[PDB]
Design a protein around this ligand. Structure first.
Ligand SMILES: Nc1ncnc2c1ncn2[C@@H]1O[C@H](COP(=O)(O)OP(=O)(O)OP(=O)(O)O)[C@@H](O)[C@H]1O
Ligand SMILES: [Ca+2]
Ligand SMILES: [Ca+2]
Ligand SMILES: [Ca+2]
Ligand SMILES: [Cl-]
Lengths: 362, 122
């Protein structure tokens, strides 16, 4: 009798909770702060003490790059957020598509040797999202704070030769909104101001169905303009920046990037899969992650992919309402199933076989 | 695996229907085959006998009011049953009211729906 813990580690936020819940009970920023002048603070606490700490993100574009700080994030997760003994719960952890083997092994070693977990399992974020949508076949477009991926999945398993990565995601859009607000005379530049602008972005932005036409209509009146109350009580007004900002998802050149937009990338991903399964991918384009939350995204993606795809294909973009946490929810469901007991790696297996066990078992 | 229902799966030609109930795969009473609760999700295995061998089609059926734990579990259990059958099953997603003719044709009396279902596991 033992409930698994579910931990979804993101570039921007950690989502954590207990298997069988419909949503993470703990969500906090993936930030570790250490004294500028000397051990560590994590999440919201770190941001409140930005004045005395150097703040770092241990996960970049979905990949762990600072293992010492990542262990601080996990210790914070177990001890300050969940108040769970890691040595007494199976843990399901998530990983990015194309996560390097060495990183998976290091995560496994830390769990079994630093946190002494009795059992663990590593799942691919996009696959958990597809399951959470009630599908075994589809292509997931997962866009978070640090990275976007398109992940074609057939009968339960990702097709690795067709996975695309696009480093453009929510933080780039936050930074781009900070940039274009200078047109109106705003200077948002500090770390704290960026958190403000992130919230403005989430509250006020939307994706235009046709960008060029939206630019023309927005110029004909002030109906585009919407306001936002800043912490200090001042009110900011935002106009066509509302849809110019997330337009960068479709036109990365707005950011000075040569990357293809998310519509082109989803199309290219589907094409890498053999012609006999593409119908089920085009018909099951599933959105995942916080940066897919913009109003208008499904209608825009449908129009743009329909234009790219063969005219005999049926395009269907699925936008689940809880898709901001669909990775976590998928992990919660998976780890609740009667059958999950035989999917995990036990510590005794790890002790006998070492961290490489993770590949044969996950 | 060790799940008792996996061990029964696909042994003989016929039709096997399970309902997702609180994150588990529970056999549907045979008397109720063909009548699906709109509040629930189900997994269906159709086994056909060929030139010696057996062929497998796995369908997961999603009622219009089933909860996300139920539809998600139906999808995952479908993958796991396929794996247990060495990947030889063909998987089919079946949505209430838009089911494939192959799925409908499993039921001599036709597909029927009923109100209600088992409570979500959330
Ligand atoms: N309603 C919203 N509209 C637009 N963007 C949003 C909304 N809600 C959240 N976001 C954005 O989604 C991002 C966080 O999403 P998510 O939690 O999926 O990412 P993550 O897992 O931390 O990062 P990654 O998956 O890139 O490693 C942030 O950029 C945030 O501003
Ligand atoms: Ca993520
Ligand atoms: Ca139900
Ligand atoms: Ca199969
Ligand atoms: Cl076309």
């Amino acid at each position: 009798d033992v409930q698994a813990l579910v931990v979804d580690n993101g570039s921007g936020n950690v989502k954590a909770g207990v298997a069988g819940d419909d949503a993470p009970r703990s969500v906090f920023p993936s930030i570790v702060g250490r004294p500028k002048n000397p051990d560590a603070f994590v999440g919201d606490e770190a941001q409140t003490k930005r004045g005395i700490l150097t703040l770092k993100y241990p996960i970049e574009h979905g990949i762990v790059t600072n293992w010492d700080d990542m262990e601080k994030i996990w210790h914070h997760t177990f001890y300050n957020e969940l108040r769970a003994a890691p040595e007494e719960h199976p843990v399901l952890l998530t990983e990015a598509p194309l996560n390097p083997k060495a990183n998976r092994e290091r995560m496994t070693q830390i769990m079994f040797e630093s946190f002494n977990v009795p059992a663990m399992y590593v799942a691919i974020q996009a696959v958990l999202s597809l399951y959470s949508s009630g599908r075994t076949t589809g292509i997931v477009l997962d866009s978070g704070d640090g990275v976007s991926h398109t992940v074609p999945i057939y009968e339960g398993y990702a097709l690795p030769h067709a996975i695309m990565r696009l480093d453009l995601a929510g933080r780039d859009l936050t930074e781009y909104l900070m940039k274009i607000l200078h047109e109106r005379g705003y200077g948002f530049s500090t770390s704290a101001e960026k958190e403000i602008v992130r919230d403005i972005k989430e509250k006020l932005c939307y994706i235009a169905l046709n960008f060029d036409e939206e630019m023309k209509t927005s110029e004909q009146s002030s109906d585009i303009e919407k306001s936002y109350e800043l912490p200090d009580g001042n009110i900011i007004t935002v106009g066509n920046e509302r849809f110019r900002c997330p337009e960068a998802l479709f036109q990365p050149s707005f950011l000075g990037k040569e990357a293809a937009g998310i519509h082109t990338t989803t199309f290219n991903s589907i094409k890498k899969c053999d012609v006999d399964i593409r119908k089920d991918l085009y018909g099951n384009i599933v959105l995942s992650g916080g940066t897919t939350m913009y109003e208008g995204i499904g209608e825009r993606l449908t129009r743009d992919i329909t234009t790219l795809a063969p005219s005999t294909m049926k395009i269907k973009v699925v936008a689940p309402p809880e898709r901001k946490y669909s990775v976590w929810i998928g992990g919660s469901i998976l780890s609740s199933l009667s059958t999950f007991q035989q999917m995990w790696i036990t510590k005794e297996e790890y002790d006998e076989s070492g961290p490489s066990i993770v590949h044969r078992k996950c | 695996v060790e799940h008792p229902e996996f061990l029964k799966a696909g042994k003989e030609p016929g039709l096997q229907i399970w309902r997702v109930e609180k994150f588990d795969l529970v056999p549907v009473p045979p008397n109720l085959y063909g009548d699906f609760f709109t509040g629930d999700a189900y997994v269906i295995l159709k086994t056909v006998q060929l030139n010696g061998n057996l062929q497998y089609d796995l369908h997961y059926w999603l009622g219009n009011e089933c909860s996300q734990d139920e539809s998600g579990a139906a999808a995952i259990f479908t993958v796991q049953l396929d794996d247990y059958l060495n990947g030889r099953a063909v998987q089919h997603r079946e949505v209430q009211g838009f089911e494939s003719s192959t799925f409908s044709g499993y039921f001599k009396s036709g597909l029927k729906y009923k109100k209600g279902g088992v409570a979500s596991g959330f």
